[PDB]
Design an enzyme around this catalytic site. Structure first.
Site, PDB file in Angstrom:
ATOM      1  N   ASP A 118       0.850  -1.179   0.000  1.00 24.00           N
ATOM      2  CA  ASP A 118       0.000   0.000   0.000  1.00 24.00           C
ATOM      3  C   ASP A 118       0.894   1.240   0.000  1.00 24.00           C
ATOM      4  O   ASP A 118       2.114   1.153   0.174  1.00 24.00           O
ATOM      5  CB  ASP A 118      -0.974  -0.038   1.180  1.00 24.00           C
ATOM      6  CG  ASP A 118      -1.888  -1.254   1.130  1.00 24.00           C
ATOM      7  OD1 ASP A 118      -1.478  -2.304   0.577  1.00 24.00           O
ATOM      8  OD2 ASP A 118      -3.019  -1.164   1.636  1.00 24.00           O
ATOM      9  N   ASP A 143      -3.453  -3.130   7.255  1.00 19.55           N
ATOM     10  CA  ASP A 143      -3.645  -2.280   8.426  1.00 19.55           C
ATOM     11  C   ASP A 143      -5.032  -2.281   9.087  1.00 19.55           C
ATOM     12  O   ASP A 143      -5.132  -1.986  10.286  1.00 19.55           O
ATOM     13  CB  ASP A 143      -3.287  -0.827   8.050  1.00 19.55           C
ATOM     14  CG  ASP A 143      -4.119  -0.282   6.884  1.00 19.55           C
ATOM     15  OD1 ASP A 143      -4.300  -1.029   5.906  1.00 19.55           O
ATOM     16  OD2 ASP A 143      -4.587   0.883   6.947  1.00 19.55           O
ATOM     17  N   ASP A 190      -9.177  -5.929   5.542  1.00 16.68           N
ATOM     18  CA  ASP A 190      -7.992  -6.607   5.010  1.00 16.68           C
ATOM     19  C   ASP A 190      -7.797  -8.049   5.499  1.00 16.68           C
ATOM     20  O   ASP A 190      -7.265  -8.883   4.751  1.00 16.68           O
ATOM     21  CB  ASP A 190      -6.749  -5.780   5.338  1.00 16.68           C
ATOM     22  CG  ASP A 190      -6.496  -4.670   4.308  1.00 16.68           C
ATOM     23  OD1 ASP A 190      -7.115  -3.580   4.397  1.00 16.68           O
ATOM     24  OD2 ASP A 190      -5.669  -4.897   3.401  1.00 16.68           O
TER      25      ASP A 190
HETATM   26  N1  LIG Z   1     -10.931  11.834   7.478  1.00 15.06           N
HETATM   27  C1  LIG Z   1     -11.245  11.751   6.181  1.00 15.06           C
HETATM   28  N2  LIG Z   1     -12.502  12.073   5.802  1.00 15.06           N
HETATM   29  C2  LIG Z   1     -12.824  11.994   4.508  1.00 15.06           C
HETATM   30  N3  LIG Z   1     -12.059  11.626   3.478  1.00 15.06           N
HETATM   31  C3  LIG Z   1     -10.824  11.313   3.881  1.00 15.06           C
HETATM   32  C4  LIG Z   1     -10.342  11.348   5.180  1.00 15.06           C
HETATM   33  N4  LIG Z   1      -9.011  10.958   5.220  1.00 15.06           N
HETATM   34  C5  LIG Z   1      -8.725  10.703   3.967  1.00 15.06           C
HETATM   35  N5  LIG Z   1      -9.770  10.904   3.103  1.00 15.06           N
HETATM   36  C6  LIG Z   1      -9.776  10.700   1.663  1.00 15.06           C
HETATM   37  O1  LIG Z   1     -10.767   9.733   1.370  1.00 15.06           O
HETATM   38  C7  LIG Z   1     -10.271   8.783   0.402  1.00 15.06           C
HETATM   39  C8  LIG Z   1     -10.185   7.419   1.040  1.00 15.06           C
HETATM   40  O2  LIG Z   1      -8.804   7.000   1.074  1.00 15.06           O
HETATM   41  P1  LIG Z   1      -8.364   5.678   1.815  1.00 15.06           P
HETATM   42  O3  LIG Z   1      -8.240   5.863   3.276  1.00 15.06           O
HETATM   43  O4  LIG Z   1      -9.283   4.537   1.383  1.00 15.06           O
HETATM   44  O5  LIG Z   1      -6.948   5.401   1.172  1.00 15.06           O
HETATM   45  P2  LIG Z   1      -5.558   6.168   1.064  1.00 15.06           P
HETATM   46  O6  LIG Z   1      -5.626   7.477   1.740  1.00 15.06           O
HETATM   47  O7  LIG Z   1      -5.154   6.202  -0.411  1.00 15.06           O
HETATM   48  O8  LIG Z   1      -4.587   5.158   1.804  1.00 15.06           O
HETATM   49  P3  LIG Z   1      -3.990   3.685   1.628  1.00 15.06           P
HETATM   50  O9  LIG Z   1      -3.400   3.526   0.268  1.00 15.06           O
HETATM   51  O10 LIG Z   1      -2.953   3.561   2.750  1.00 15.06           O
HETATM   52  O11 LIG Z   1      -5.168   2.753   1.915  1.00 15.06           O
HETATM   53  C9  LIG Z   1      -8.946   9.351  -0.097  1.00 15.06           C
HETATM   54  O12 LIG Z   1      -9.142  10.166  -1.247  1.00 15.06           O
HETATM   55  C10 LIG Z   1      -8.457  10.165   1.102  1.00 15.06           C
HETATM   56  O13 LIG Z   1      -7.607  11.236   0.708  1.00 15.06           O
HETATM   57 MG   LIG Z   2      -4.349   1.865   4.716  1.00 17.32          MG
END
Ligand SMILES: Nc1ncnc2c1ncn2[C@@H]1O[C@H](COP(=O)(O)OP(=O)(O)OP(=O)(O)O)[C@@H](O)[C@H]1O
Ligand SMILES: [Mg+2]
Ligand SMILES: C=C(/C=C\C[C@@H](O)[C@@H](O)[C@H](O)C/C=C/C=C\[C@@H](O)C[C@@H]1O[C@H](C[C@@H](O)[C@H](O)C[C@H]2O[C@H]([C@H](O)[C@H](O)CC[C@H](O)/C=C/[C@H](C)[C@@H](O)C[C@]3(O)O[C@H](C[C@@H](O)CCCCCCC[C@@]45C[C@@H](C)C[C@@](C)(O4)[C@@H](C[C@@H](C)CCCCC[C@@H](O)[C@H](O)[C@H](O)[C@@H](O)[C@H](O)[C@H]4O[C@H](C[C@H](O)[C@H](O)/C(C)=C/[C@H](O)C[C@@H](C)[C@H](O)C(=O)N/C=C/C(=O)NCCCO)[C@H](O)[C@@H](O)[C@@H]4O)O5)[C@H](O)[C@@H](O)[C@H]3O)C[C@@H](O)[C@@H]2O)[C@@H](O)[C@H](O)[C@H]1O)CC[C@H](O)[C@@H](O)[C@H](O)[C@H](C)C[C@H]1O[C@H](/C=C\[C@@H](O)[C@H](O)C[C@@H]2C[C@@H]3C[C@H](O2)[C@@H](CC[C@H]2O[C@H](CN)C[C@H]2O)O3)[C@@H](O)[C@H](O)[C@H]1O
Ligand SMILES: CCCCCCCC/C=C\CCCCCCCC(=O)OC[C@H](COP(=O)(O)OCC[N+](C)(C)C)OC(=O)CCCCCCC/C=C\CCCCCCCC
Ligand SMILES: CCCCCCCC/C=C\CCCCCCCC(=O)OC[C@H](COP(=O)(O)OCC[N+](C)(C)C)OC(=O)CCCCCCC/C=C\CCCCCCCC
Ligand SMILES: CCCCCCCC/C=C\CCCCCCCC(=O)OC[C@H](COP(=O)(O)OCC[N+](C)(C)C)OC(=O)CCCCCCC/C=C\CCCCCCCC
Ligand SMILES: CCCCCCCC/C=C\CCCCCCCC(=O)OC[C@H](COP(=O)(O)OCC[N+](C)(C)C)OC(=O)CCCCCCC/C=C\CCCCCCCC
Ligand SMILES: CCCCCCCC/C=C\CCCCCCCC(=O)OC[C@H](COP(=O)(O)OCC[N+](C)(C)C)OC(=O)CCCCCCC/C=C\CCCCCCCC
Ligand SMILES: CCCCCCCC/C=C\CCCCCCCC(=O)OC[C@H](COP(=O)(O)OCC[N+](C)(C)C)OC(=O)CCCCCCC/C=C\CCCCCCCC
Ligand SMILES: CC(C)CCC[C@@H](C)[C@H]1CC[C@H]2[C@@H]3CC=C4C[C@@H](O)CC[C@]4(C)[C@H]3CC[C@]12C
Ligand SMILES: CC(C)CCC[C@@H](C)[C@H]1CC[C@H]2[C@@H]3CC=C4C[C@@H](O)CC[C@]4(C)[C@H]3CC[C@]12C
Ligand SMILES: CC(C)CCC[C@@H](C)[C@H]1CC[C@H]2[C@@H]3CC=C4C[C@@H](O)CC[C@]4(C)[C@H]3CC[C@]12C
Ligand code: NA
Ligand code: NA
Ligand code: NA
Ligand code: NA
EC number: 7.2.2.13
Length: 979
Positions: free
Chosen positions: A332, A673, A677
């Site tokens: 990831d 994480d 998963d």
């Molecule tokens: N607290 C939050 N509230 C709303 N949207 C959020 C919040 N934190 C992150 N996001 C956004 O919402 C989306 C969901 O991302 P998600 O957590 O699934 O994956 P990521 O940030 O790419 O991380 P990873 O690759 O580690 O899973 C992303 O576009 C992220 O930037």
């Molecule tokens: Mg993650």
């Protein structure tokens, strides 16, 4: 079946304040820690019986017994007896005793290192004392305090739920069924296992949060009483182990056969029926190798200690072996590749791009802070955000203090407090009525609050999320303060804005809000988060917000090493294909020169559909297409493309990708994480769970735990995994060679009828001297340059003990050490008067104590001890010739592909072994008294050099043997001698 008041009145506890710290410690010391007790075991009794009295040492125990009886019949009968038997027994007994002590020092050591890794990653629960939340080791929870749980954590003790928010638990381990049963504060069934107001030990909260009073603690738990049986449990045996054994079995078959064969040769030559069984027993004992499994377990344990120092904790030993064969790493981005220390860079509003970061002040001339649109945007950011500054940071600056929450909300909160003001008042100005939390499946966060306008009592709704999702929920746009529609002109300006902010490697979020009509939703109506109480669409988009997050330092080199090893890297991220493509461009996943279908379409100015899919080496697949796609298409992308990137991928999706990677016939490792998963973490071959940010579920379900959450750590771990293999093969190769020189003397002695070249004491000296310390030193060897510049291994096609190891050890190197010892033997006899031609057949006469008249070549007449002395001088010389040839065998064992001039002599333990062995031989041969006790005699100076030519030939042969390998891959030498 009680109440919250009756419960708090029985154990004593505040439903809203919990226990006091002093009271908590009073109970903690009053009834013992919340940890189960160790089970029954066997002390040093059964630990020592297996060592000193096992299967191979038993025969030695007999040798000792027999010899003692030989001395008793002597002293009782004969006047003035001899003492070779008493000292022989005193020596044999000491050998069985020492072998036992050494083995004990190894068995314990391993049993202790394993126990150390269990306390490296302990567990810590969330308890509320004196009205404050604190995370303490699971061993400090007592009965009565308040405990809070969150989806992904484990229930510490037996709780009594007092307040829940859509909380579900997995009650599969105790009774066995994984369907998530919801935990509610109310009571439902007379059976405690069926009611929902009780949380249980070792269970996990799948989704939701809850509170509860600890009713049962420690061994006084359900699984604690059931543990009486659990105690026994179960363990396993690694592959490598079942590989070594298998070998032992085959060898035993070969040995038993040869025993019966040597038997027919003996009787066809006239021995005694008894002598043939004595030979059968001795030969089968000399053909079966001893030590293999002990060295495999010790090497593995030591390597594990090496890996834990480099940040990789393994839940078992099978993981140490599977890590080396790793072909694909499904990792990831945010947490493994990037640093999670993000900061806002560009904001979008009023069709304009605005910069920020006013150097921890109000300078930088970013944008008019007076902008109306900015007031709305700053307000939604400060309102929908759920993070908060850590208590007691009133001294540090606005950027350097500590916050609790997602990294996205932290960067947002800091920007708003630096150039916008205190959030606690901004949050109280508008009272929060109902809030809905973020999620990876939803991808948005929303909440409704009251409006602080003293002239407008309506309700305000705010939501943030991925810009595409929010765009699909808006039909208006807050422009220059007023509202306007979302037509195609500004829609295209918004798309070009996404590529502008994305190409910069920054993350981007969308922010929108809407004024709920107080006529359809009055001030008294409660909007419970169950049904569509808020208009998802028709919202008012205010503007985008972008933030940066850089990659780790060592990451670029890690991907380069993977590319040279022949390992495919895939980025699975929940971000956009641009930001994905960019991060890939930086880390090295997508190297220069390779293009995608869109790149070729852009260069050629041709539709993407017209371009040939095979023309592109790398690609980027989206989530919607993945949902729609079948199996053959997935195999097409995995087989034809070299660099594949996956964007906007949900968690549940991951398993399909893993199943596709295994279908090819590849070993995969996945980093996890969260809670969704867990299934994946079990199907893959190596489950890497995050240690810093992971949850109890991810750790329980995985094979390994990353202590630092770093991608660079992994590649280093695989390097450590391959070294184990290389060193194991080297050590086994060094141990098996000495078998030939110890068996050839007993063969020529019986067949050719010559004086015995090697005896019992001398053989024991060889085994204990040149095979113990040098072998151990080999384990500590360094890695040859080539380790990462070589392809992975296929366990089906490449084994540890194959038909090539026996070819090099027994066939080529062995026969040479045998000839080297035979030369020293022939020389000693020829000089003392006995020549070689006259030696064939003298055994019958030689071994007769009564022929004091034995005549030599020069015609002299020898007594019995006068000739036995020369024979013993030959035993000692053979011994030294063996140590001398061992020098060469050990040197050549350091490397199998590179030369020693390339590798170098930086191993200190190996040097120690060379000097120490030489010392042992010189000491035993020259010490004044070994004659009487051990039967070794001084060696003259011209003899030590007899084994030198055979020692140099071995070294030169291996050196060339390697040059030919390096120059001609897949040739005859590599097919035949590369073990
Ligand atoms: N607290 C939050 N509230 C709303 N949207 C959020 C919040 N934190 C992150 N996001 C956004 O919402 C989306 C969901 O991302 P998600 O957590 O699934 O994956 P990521 O940030 O790419 O991380 P990873 O690759 O580690 O899973 C992303 O576009 C992220 O930037
Ligand atoms: Mg993650
Ligand atoms: C601890 C161990 C165990 C022992 C350790 C041992 O050493 C020591 O602890 C000592 O014990 C210490 C203990 C001491 C205890 C006490 C002492 O303190 C105290 C003193 O002891 C002293 C004794 C001591 O001083 C002695 O001397 C010690 C030595 O003992 C052994 C001696 O030699 C020998 O025993 C001497 C004793 C005596 O001789 C015994 C004789 C026989 C019992 C028996 O015959 C006598 C007698 O007859 O028994 C009768 C009882 C009967 O019921 C029994 C029934 C018989 C059954 C018959 C059936 C046979 C049979 C069986 C079938 C399965 C197959 C079959 C084919 O044969 C089949 C066929 C049938 C149809 C045959 C029928 C025949 C009939 C026979 C019967 O009927 C009877 O005979 C008959 O009834 C009789 O009554 C009658 O008289 C018969 O007489 C005749 C019979 C014939 O004779 C007879 O039949 C014969 C000849 C048969 C012949 O084979 C025929 C052939 C010609 C053939 O046919 C032939 O023509 N061929 C022609 C070919 C030809 O033309 N070819 C031409 C070609 C043309 O092309 C006549 O013919 C018949 O008709 C007639 O009926 O059926 C009855 O009682 C009486 O009758 C009695 O007299 C030897 C040793 O044991 C010991 O040194 C006493 O004197 C003293 O008073 C006392 O105080 C384990 C061993 C170790 O593991 C191993 O290492 C071992 O140590 C080494 C191997 C040693 C060797 O090397 C040493 C140096 C260094 C070594 O240590 C190294 O270590 C070697 C190592 C080994 C390995 C490899 C390598 O090297 C190293 C590598 C290891 C490395 O790798 C490792 C990795 N894992 C790491 C590292 O370790 O390890 C040397 O020093 C050794 O010397 C050397 O050996
Ligand atoms: C079971 C696995 C064993 C592994 C290694 C075992 C090592 C065994 C080596 C020797 C043991 C056999 C005993 C040797 C005694 C034979 C004596 C002999 O042979 O007497 C012939 C000549 C002596 O001539 P003279 O000058 O006295 O006559 C003068 C004539 N006037 C003066 C009239 C002109 O001796 C010569 O020529 C030279 C003979 C010296 C020894 C040669 C033995 C055979 C040759 C090589 C053996 C190594 C084979 C390696 C195989 C590797 C795979 C196993
Ligand atoms: C009292 C007891 C004394 C014991 C004395 C023992 C003496 C040693 C016995 C024989 C030595 C000769 C063995 C020669 C075998 C060929 C070795 C060979 O071909 O190595 C090839 C390597 C080239 O590797 P590369 O370019 O792939 O590395 C690339 C590294 N990367 C990847 C970082 C760029 O070359 C190298 O390392 C350069 C190393 C050059 C070493 C030359 C030694 C030869 C000089 C004299 C030999 C003795 C002749 C007769 C003596 C009788 C004595 C009485
Ligand atoms: C009379 C005739 C007899 C013939 C009998 C034959 C006997 C056996 C034949 C040959 C065996 C001995 C060969 C010694 C080889 C020396 C090679 C050497 O010199 O390679 C120079 C190295 C390389 O250095 P680098 O910085 O480029 O490596 C960089 C490494 N990377 C790239 C991983 C960072 O330098 C280093 O290893 C650092 C310096 C290490 C110096 C080691 C000196 C000790 C050597 C042997 C000890 C004696 C044992 C015998 C005990 C009995 C005595 C009574
Ligand atoms: C690493 C493991 C690999 C090898 C392990 C081997 C395991 C062996 C374990 C124990 C073996 C014990 C051997 C006992 C030594 C001799 C004891 C003994 O039974 O002696 C008897 C002899 C009496 O003979 P006689 O009256 O018939 O002579 C008549 C001479 N005519 C007539 C010609 C004048 O006594 C004498 O000669 C007096 C001479 C006394 C000898 C003193 C030597 C000390 C022995 C061992 C100490 C060394 C330990 C190493 C420490 C290293 C520190 C760094
Ligand atoms: C940095 C640390 C390095 C450590 C390396 C290992 C340390 C080596 C330790 C000691 C070796 C020196 C031994 C000297 C002993 C001389 C004693 C002696 O007085 O002895 C005389 C014998 C002549 O006996 P005979 O039968 O004629 O008279 C017998 C007459 N009766 C019996 C009637 C009395 O002569 C002999 O024993 C000749 C003795 C052997 C001559 C030495 C040849 C080796 C020279 C250099 C090789 C060193 C290896 C380094 C390789 C590095 C590669 C990178
Ligand atoms: C006391 C004495 C101390 C010193 C003793 C030294 C003894 C060691 C001397 C040589 C080591 C022998 C190693 C044996 C390996 C030879 C194997 C061989 O035949 O491999 C040939 C390969 C071919 O590979 P491929 O892939 O084309 O096969 C394709 C095969 N298909 C077509 C079936 C697919 O390589 C080739 O043809 C081209 C490469 C040819 C390499 C020749 C190396 C010669 C090096 C040293 C020998 C000179 C020593 C002089 C000392 C004088 C002493 C008095
Ligand atoms: C496989 C192993 C453990 C078997 C060991 C067998 C031992 C106990 C056997 C092998 C040969 C036997 C010896 C053969 C010949 C004799 C001569 C006789 O006058 C006294 C007994 C004596 C000395 C025997 C004692 C027992 C003996 C040493
Ligand atoms: C003590 C003496 C007499 C024993 C001699 C044993 C020799 C002949 C044995 C030892 C190891 C053996 C080799 C072991 C493995 C292989 C690989 C196989 O694909 C072809 C045979 C070959 C190459 C064997 C040939 C015979 C061999 C060289
Ligand atoms: C590189 C190669 C070809 C060199 C081979 C050298 C040979 C001929 C040398 C090496 C060691 C030498 C031996 C060293 C010691 C002794 C003991 C002495 O009391 C008799 C001669 C004898 C037995 C030598 C004979 C010649 C010998 C075997
Ligand atoms: Na051994
Ligand atoms: Na698994
Ligand atoms: Na060896
Ligand atoms: Na051995």
């Amino acid at each position: 079946k009680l109440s919250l008041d009756e419960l708090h009145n029985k154990y004593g506890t505040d439903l809203t304040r919990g226990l006091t710290n002093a009271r908590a410690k009073e109970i903690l010391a009053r009834d013992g820690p919340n940890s189960l007790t160790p089970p029954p075991t066997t002390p040093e009794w059964i630990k020592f019986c297996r060592q000193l009295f096992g299967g191979f040492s038993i025969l030695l125990w007999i040798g000792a017994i027999l010899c003692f009886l030989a001395y008793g019949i002597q002293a009782a009968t004969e006047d003035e007896p001899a003492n070779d038997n008493l000292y022989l027994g005193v020596v044999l007994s000491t050998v069985v005793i020492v072998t036992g002590c050494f083995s004990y020092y190894q068995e314990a050591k391993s049993s202790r290192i394993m126990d150390s890794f269990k306390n490296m990653v302990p567990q810590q629960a969330l308890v509320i004392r004196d009205g404050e939340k604190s995370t303490i080791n699971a061993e400090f929870v007592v009965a009565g305090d308040l405990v809070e749980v969150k989806g992904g954590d484990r229930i510490p003790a037996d709780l009594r739920i007092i307040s829940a928010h859509g909380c579900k638990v997995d009650n599969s381990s105790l009774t066995g069924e994984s369907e998530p049963q919801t935990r509610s504060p109310e009571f439902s069934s007379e059976n405690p296992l069926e009611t929902r107001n009780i949380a249980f030990f070792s269970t996990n909260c799948v989704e939701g949060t809850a509170r509860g009073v600890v009713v049962y603690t420690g061994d006084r738990t359900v699984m604690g009483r059931i543990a009486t049986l659990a105690s026994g449990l179960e363990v396993g045996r690694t592959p490598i182990a079942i590989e070594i054994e298998h070998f032992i079995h085959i060898i035993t078959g070969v040995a038993v056969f040869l025993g019966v064969s040597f038997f027919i040769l003996s009787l066809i030559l006239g021995y005694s029926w008894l002598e043939a069984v004595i030979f059968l027993i001795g030969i089968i004992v000399a053909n079966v190798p001893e030590g293999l499994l002990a060295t495999v377990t010790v090497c593995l344990t030591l390597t594990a200690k090496r890996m834990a120092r480099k940040n990789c904790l393994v839940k078992n030993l099978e993981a140490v072996e599977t890590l080396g064969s790793t072909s694909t790493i499904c990792s990831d981005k945010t947490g493994t590749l990037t640093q999670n220390r993000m900061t806002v860079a560009h904001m979008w509003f009023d069709n304009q791009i605005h910069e920020a970061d006013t150097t921890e002040n109000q300078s930088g001339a970013a944008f008019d802070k007076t902008s109306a649109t900015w007031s709305a945007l700053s307000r939604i950011a400060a309102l929908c955000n759920r993070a908060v500054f850590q208590a007691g940071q009133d001294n540090v600056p606005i950027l350097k203090r500590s916050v609790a929450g997602d990294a996205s909300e932290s960067a947002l909160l800091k920007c708003i407090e630096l150039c916008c003001g205190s959030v606690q008042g901004m949050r109280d100005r508008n009272p929060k009525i109902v809030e809905i939390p973020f999620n990876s499946t939803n991808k948005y966060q929303l909440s409704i609050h009251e409006n602080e306008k003293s002239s407008e009592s309506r309700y305000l709704l705010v939501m943030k999320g991925a810009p595409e999702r929010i765009l699909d929920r808006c039909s208006t746009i807050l422009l220059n303060g007023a509202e306007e529609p979302l037509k195609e002109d500004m829609k295209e300006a918004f798309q070009n804005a996404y590529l502008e902010l994305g190409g910069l490697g920054e993350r981007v979020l969308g922010f929108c809000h809407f004024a709920l009509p107080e006529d359809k939703y009055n001030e008294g109506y409660p909007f419970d988060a169950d049904e569509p109480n808020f208009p998802t669409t028709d919202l008012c988009f205010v503007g985008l917000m972008a933030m940066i997050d850089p990659p780790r330092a060592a990451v670029p080199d890690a991907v380069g090493k993977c590319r040279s090893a022949g390992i495919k890297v895939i980025m699975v991220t929940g971000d956009h294909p641009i930001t994905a493509k960019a991060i890939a461009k930086g880390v090295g996943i997508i190297s220069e020169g390779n293009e995608t279908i869109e790149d070729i379409a852009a260069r050629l100015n041709i539709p993407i559909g017209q371009v040939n899919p095979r023309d592109a080496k790398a690609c980027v697949v989206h989530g919607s297409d993945l949902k729609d796609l079948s199996t053959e298409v997935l195999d097409d992308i995995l087989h034809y493309h070299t660099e594949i990137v996956f964007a906007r991928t949900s968690p549940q999706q991951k398993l399909i990708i893993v199943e596709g990677c295994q279908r090819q016939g590849a070993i995969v490792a996945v980093t996890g994480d969260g809670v969704n998963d867990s299934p994946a973490l079990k199907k893959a071959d190596i489950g890497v769970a995050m240690g810093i940010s992971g949850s109890d579920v991810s750790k329980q379900a995985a094979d390994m735990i990353l202590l630092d959450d770093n991608f660079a750590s992994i590649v280093t771990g695989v390097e450590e995994g391959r070294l184990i293999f290389d060193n194991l093969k080297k050590s086994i190769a060094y141990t098996l060679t000495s078998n030939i020189p110890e068996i050839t003397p007993f063969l020529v002695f019986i067949i050719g009828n010559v004086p015995l070249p090697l005896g019992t004491v001398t053989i024991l000296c060889i085994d204990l001297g040149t095979d113990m310390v040098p072998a151990i030193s080999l384990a500590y060897e360094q890695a040859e340059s080539d380790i990462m510049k070589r392809q992975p291994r296929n366990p089906k096609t490449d084994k540890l003990v194959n038909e090539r190891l026996i070819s090099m050890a027994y066939g080529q190197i062995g026969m040479i050490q045998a000839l080297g010892g035979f030369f020293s033997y022939f020389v000693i006899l020829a000089e003392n008067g006995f020549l070689p031609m006259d030696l064939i057949g003298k055994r019958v006469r030689w071994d007769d104590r009564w022929i004091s008249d034995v005549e030599d070549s020069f015609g002299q007449q020898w007594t019995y001890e006068q000739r036995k002395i020369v024979e013993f001088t030959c035993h000692t010389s053979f011994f030294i010739s063996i140590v001398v040839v061992q020098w060469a065998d050990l040197i050549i064992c350091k490397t199998r592909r590179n030369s020693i001039f390339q590798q170098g002599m930086k191993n200190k333990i190996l040097i120690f072994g060379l000097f120490e062995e030489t010392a042992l031989a010189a000491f035993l041969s020259y010490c004044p008294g070994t004659d009487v006790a051990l039967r070794m005699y001084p060696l003259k100076p011209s003899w030590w050099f007899c084994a030198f030519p055979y020692s140099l030939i071995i070294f030169l042969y291996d050196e060339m043997r390697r040059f030919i390998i390096r120059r001609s891959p897949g040739g005859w030498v590599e097919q035949e001698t590369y073990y």
